[PDB]
Amino acid sequence: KVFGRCELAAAMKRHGLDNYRGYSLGNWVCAAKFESNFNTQATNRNTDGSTDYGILQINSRWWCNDGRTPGSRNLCNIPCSALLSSDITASVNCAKKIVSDGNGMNAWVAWRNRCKGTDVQAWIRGCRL
């Protein structure tokens, strides 16, 4: 599923991501934009052989199991495929665990490079939330 900007904002808010670990909703929408362009089915292979999955491009090296990332962990205890669903629940619950692990949203490289320090509020501007 390819989300609209305000549509994703609303789904994110409903699943408790808004100001989770102090990160306003705009941060999460901006990260989703540049990680997946709002596409729940986005996948991308990393050089090390791991793969990033879903609207927030969660990586198989640590967070989910895809059966082909030798020596990886599955800290969110989910198949990586579950992160590709039109329902964002699994991606949200995993993101909550990721953003809590010490480095905040810097875990998402696109967020650090393209969202951090910017007017993230622009991403939820105009949305009926």
Instruction: Return binding residues.
Output: 101
Contact partner at residue 24 from Na ion, Cl ion, none, CB < 5 to 8 Å by partner kind:
Cl ion
Determine the interface stretch with Na ion among 29-37, 70-78, 86-94, 111-119 (rule: CB under 5 A): 70-78
Residue nearest to Cl ion (CB): 26
CB within 8 Å of 78: residues ≥ 6 apart: 64, 65, 90, 94
- Residues marked active site are found at 35, 52
Task: Tell me which of 53, 65, 76, 98 binds Cl ion, using CB under 5 A.
Answer: 65
Is residue 59 near Na ion by the rule CB under 5 A?
Answer: no
CA distance 78 to 94: 9
| Radius of gyration, alpha carbons of the chain | 14
The structure tokens listed for 41 are 């089915």
Is residue 69 near Cl ion by the rule CB under 5 A?
Answer: yes
CA distance 34 to 28: 10
Least separation in angstroms between CB 73 and Cl ion: 4
Task: Give the strand order in the sheet containing 58-59.
Answer: 43-45, 51-53, 58-59
Task: Tell me which of 3, 72, 83, 88 binds Na ion, using CB under 5 A.
Answer: 72
Query: Where does this chain bind Na ion (CB under 5 A)?
Result: 60, 65, 69, 72, 74
